[PDB]
């Protein structure tokens, strides 16, 4: 039932791809657990990151990309629709110009493409959260 965390899955995305995450944080929001979603160009975890999605539960969400091992301009968002101790559904919809990250079907963040989504070869879900479901839809 439970997916192993860090969860690493080979995947390739394109305009229309949606990344579905269903899990629960492992700590109360006061202790500030993190959640991270990274879209990699290779199966090796040290590879470049097309889309970096890091949540600091209860505080903020930061997104960035890693190109040739270098972190680019970080984009910060203070919107925290996630609710303390409640299970969440996380969906990242790929659009031609940007990403669409919905929280329980509710828009919270966007990220304009810096690397074309066809470069994604690996998706990893890892941080202080429990993971129950992970699916890619088209």
């Amino acid at each position, epitope marked *: 039932s439970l997916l192993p965390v860090p969860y690493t899955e080979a995947a390739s995305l394109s305009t229309g791809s949606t990344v579905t995450i269903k899990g629960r944080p492992l700590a109360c929001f006061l202790n500030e657990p993190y959640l991270q979603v990274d879209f990699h*160009t290779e199966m090796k975890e040290e590879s*470049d990151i*097309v889309f970096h999605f890091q949540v600091c539960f209860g505080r903020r969400v930061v997104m960035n*990309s890693r*190109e*040739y091992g*270098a972190w*680019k*301009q970080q984009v910060e968002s203070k919107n925290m629709p996630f609710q303390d101790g409640q299970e969440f559904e996380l969906s990242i919809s790929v659009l031609p110009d940007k990403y669409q990250v919905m929280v329980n079907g509710q828009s919270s963040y966007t990220f*304009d*493409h*810096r*690397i*074309k989504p066809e*470069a994604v070869k690996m998706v990893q879900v890892w941080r202080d959260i429990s993971l129950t479901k992970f699916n890619v839809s088209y």
Partner: antibody, heavy 111, light 108 residues
Framework: QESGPGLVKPSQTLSLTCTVS???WSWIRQPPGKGLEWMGV???????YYSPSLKSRTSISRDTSKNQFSLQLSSVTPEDTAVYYC??????????????WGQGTQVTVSS | QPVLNQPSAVSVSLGQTARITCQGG??????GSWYQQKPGQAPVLVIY???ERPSGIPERFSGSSSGGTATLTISRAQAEDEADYYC??????????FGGGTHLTVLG
């Protein structure tokens, strides 16, 4: 719309301004007969970026009330002689393209 | 300084199809664009995002891209297409690169 003089003494600081008439302003220069050379970018929403080769010598300012933005390349030497274009982009990325290019202006730096 | 690899000069006969490739660059991650520049005149964007052409650009111009290569296509040459042609991409989101420039000669 490009403006600014073409004579400058070496080791000085020369300025170029680009006017905007009816969303990311960049500077591209062309050394004589050479290929295009990126110099920098300044977004209205975001902040500035620079290229390492020119990073130390390049400064980009903005005047939103005038909707103008100016280039400053300090400590000029005869190597800085080039044809300067200002190109308009319409977030800004490196692979992004510029639809409206400035007419260009020739700047010659020599003793 | 970073420059993309493209031919310096290319000749094509009137009515034939000319193709310019933009290779050698740090592609796969990023997209490619193309500019048409005549001497002493400002460049004009011809192709963006490797597939679409902007309005006003004639149907003669089209672009294709794959792997680490992009191809500029001029299907039905005219005399006025005789000019210098630049491709552009980036080595990184915060650092664009530009090609050496290609002069197209309209023969016949």
């Amino acid at each position: 719309q490009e403006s600014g003089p073409g004579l400058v003494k070496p080791s000085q600081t020369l300025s170029l301004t680009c006017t905007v008439s009816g969303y990311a302003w960049s500077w591209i220069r062309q050394p004589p007969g050479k290929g295009l050379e990126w110099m920098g970018v300044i977004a209205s929403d975001g902040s500035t970026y620079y290229s390492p080769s020119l990073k130390s010598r390049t400064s980009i300012s903005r005047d939103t009330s005038k909707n103008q933005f100016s280039l400053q390349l300090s400590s000029v030497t005869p190597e800085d002689t080039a044809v300067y274009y200002c190109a308009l982009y319409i977030s800004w990325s490196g692979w992004s393209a510029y639809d409206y290019w400035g007419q260009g202006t020739q700047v010659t730096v020599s003793s | 300084q970073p420059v993309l690899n493209q031919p310096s000069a290319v000749s094509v006969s009137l009515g034939q199809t000319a193709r310019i490739t933009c290779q050698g660059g740090n592609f796969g991650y990023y997209y490619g664009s193309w500019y048409q520049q005549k001497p002493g005149q400002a460049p004009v964007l011809v192709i963006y995002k490797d597939s679409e052409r902007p309005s006003g650009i004639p149907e003669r111009f089209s672009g294709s891209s794959s792997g680490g290569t992009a191809t500029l296509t001029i299907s039905r040459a005219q005399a006025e297409d005789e000019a210098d042609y630049y491709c552009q991409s980036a080595d990184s989101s915060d650092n664009p690169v530009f090609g050496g420039g290609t002069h197209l000669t309209v023969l016949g």
